[PDB]
Design goal:
The structure is cut from a larger assembly and holds two copies of chain A.
Chain A: E1 2-7, E2 10-15, E3 21-23, E4 82-84
Antiparallel strand pairs in A: 1-2, 3-4
PDB class: virus
Keywords: Icosahedral Capsid, AAVrh.10, capsid engineering, Adeno-associated virus, Parvovirus, Gene Therapy, virus
Entry title: AAVrh.10-7x capsid
Chain lengths: 104, 103
């Protein structure tokens, strides 16, 4: 985790050793699921490319540009998440449900 | 298509009848079926009990959901209650879809 300082067009990057990041997986499928929409931001096809993580966002019901009573709002800090410093790491496992072979 | 649960083996049909009680026969034999019966009806109580399984709402939504509510404002009659003459009425259809989910 790094901090950026700017003054007089000078730009300084330094380590902030006590800062954290937060990571959680949505295991119970309680959030709008945006992955199957074929967006950008996937891991690069070439292993030596460094990539930027895409911003998360979601849509809900509307009438025009206006919300409706059913349209829902989600705070993602209302989920338990794991906080990690530079020494910490994150891991989880997942098993696919039974699905028919793709026919190649 | 009207609604509810399709069932291959639904709850069975329950059929009830008053057994016919004939009036006095002729005292000389006749083959014709007896057409003269005592007028009867029957009354009683019927009790039915269903156990329903519920699927609880797991939603992580922040803002409050729409609920089914009784109107707060005053009225001559209570909704879903008898009136002055004593008859019960249902003022509106009540559907089951209020809470929300994500696709």
């Amino acid at each position: 985790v790094k901090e950026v300082t700017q003054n007089e067009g000078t730009k300084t990057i330094a380590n902030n050793l006590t800062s954290t990041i937060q990571v959680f997986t949505d295991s119970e499928y309680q959030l709008p699921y945006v992955l199957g929409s074929a967006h950008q931001g996937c891991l690069p096809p070439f292993p030596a490319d460094v990539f930027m993580i895409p911003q998360y966002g979601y849509l809900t019901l509307n009438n025009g540009a206006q919300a409706v009573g059913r349209s829902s709002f989600y705070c993602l800090e209302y989920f338990p998440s794991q906080m990690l410093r530079t020494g910490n790491n994150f891991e989880f496992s997942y098993q696919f449900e039974d699905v028919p072979f793709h026919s190649s | 298509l009207m609604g509810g649960f399709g069932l291959k083996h639904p709850p069975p049909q329950i059929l009830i009848k008053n057994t016919p009680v004939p009036a006095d026969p002729p005292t000389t034999f006749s083959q014709a079926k007896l057409a003269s019966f005592i007028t009867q009806y029957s009354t009683g109580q019927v009790s039915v009990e269903i156990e329903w399984e519920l699927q609880k709402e797991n939603s992580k939504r922040w803002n409050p959901e729409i609920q089914y509510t009784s109107n707060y404002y005053k009225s001559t009659n209570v909704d879903f209650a008898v009136n002055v003459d004593g008859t019960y009425s249902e003022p509106r259809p009540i559907g089951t879809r209020y809470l929300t989910r994500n696709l």
